């Protein structure tokens, strides 16, 4: 079939019964770095099963007036489990990801979500309203952490770029009439074979409700949204002591 799926990796498993296939980012699977492309000389580590597993980060509430949220990678995991420990202890980093978004409702609820992956998603500021002020986004806005951050101008995605063209990026829709989950597989996206896991963020994940949630009075009003994700083919290098940030 196609509507039913089960994803198993490491010591975790995700089952679903309202799937909509699986999107592979740019038609490419995650992979390790080859010997002709690597530039550092020390032997990298590949912890395998202890880091390649599904992590559930947090839950958000979908309301009739919600605007949207974004998460930054791998900032969400820089402080979770063995993956977070390895990312703190090492200088270099390289991995892909497997994202699963959970959101379920009844057959009498309606609404649509756009789930997209935008690499190098630099967040711009409002520049003081008039535009004569040279401002930069603060820490809680550029690197919100594992708790996410809410969009202020979802029509421009806080960067002056229209949301109507966000579908050129790897994406899936969560339409409550049809499905209740989304899966996007992202390979490693960078111009360098290895990069820092703490200073640099590779991509950002966007969840914006295009069609407002609506239901009749009496039905369940609490509709949560959940994010689950698993690193794939992780490598680390340049071992030293741990650094907090």
């Amino acid at each position: 079939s196609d509507r039913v799926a089960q994803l198993t990796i490491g010591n975790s498993t995700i089952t679903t019964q309202e799937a909509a296939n699986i999107i592979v980012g740019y038609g490419e699977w995650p992979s390790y770095c080859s010997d002709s492309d690597a530039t550092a000389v020390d032997k990298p580590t590949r912890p395998d099963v202890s880091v390649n597993r599904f992590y559930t980060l947090d839950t958000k509430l979908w309301e009739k007036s919600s605007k949207g949220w974004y998460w930054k990678f791998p900032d969400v995991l820089t402080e979770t489990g063995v993956f977070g420990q390895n990312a703190q202890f090492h200088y270099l980093y390289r991995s892909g990801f497997c994202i699963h978004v959970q959101c379920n409702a009844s057959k009498f609820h309606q609404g649509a979500l756009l789930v997209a992956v935008l690499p190098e998603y630099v967040i711009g500021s409002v520049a003081g309203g008039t535009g004569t002020e040279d401002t930069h986004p603060p820490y809680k806005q550029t690197q919100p952490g594992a708790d996410g951050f809410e969009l202020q101008h979802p029509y421009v995605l806080d960067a002056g770029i229209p949301i109507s063209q966000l579908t050129v990026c790897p994406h899936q829709w969560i339409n409550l009439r049809t499905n209740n989950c989304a899966t996007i597989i992202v390979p490693y996206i960078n111009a360098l074979p290895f990069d820092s896991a703490l200073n640099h963020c590779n991509f950002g994940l966007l969840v914006v409700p295009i069609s407002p949630l609506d239901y009749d009075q009496g039905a369940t009003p609490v509709i949560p949204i959940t994010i689950t994700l698993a690193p794939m083919c992780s490598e680390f290098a340049g071992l030293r002591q741990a650094v907090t940030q």
């Binding site: 079939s1 196609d2 509507r3 296939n21 699986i22 999107i23 592979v24 740019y26 038609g27 049809t178």
Partner: protein, 58 residues
Amino acid sequence: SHENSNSATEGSTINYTTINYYKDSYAATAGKQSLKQDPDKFANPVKDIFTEMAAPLK
């Protein structure tokens, strides 16, 4: 006609035809590219491809 191999498109799958008068290969003309496309990489990036005639969700 002995020159350095230092253009920006070396180590690429496609070959150009260009004109150069110097020993550095990045001074040449733009030339003609080859006409190849991979539209599926953006338009149909799914895991299991489905035929046109059927229903995408069954």
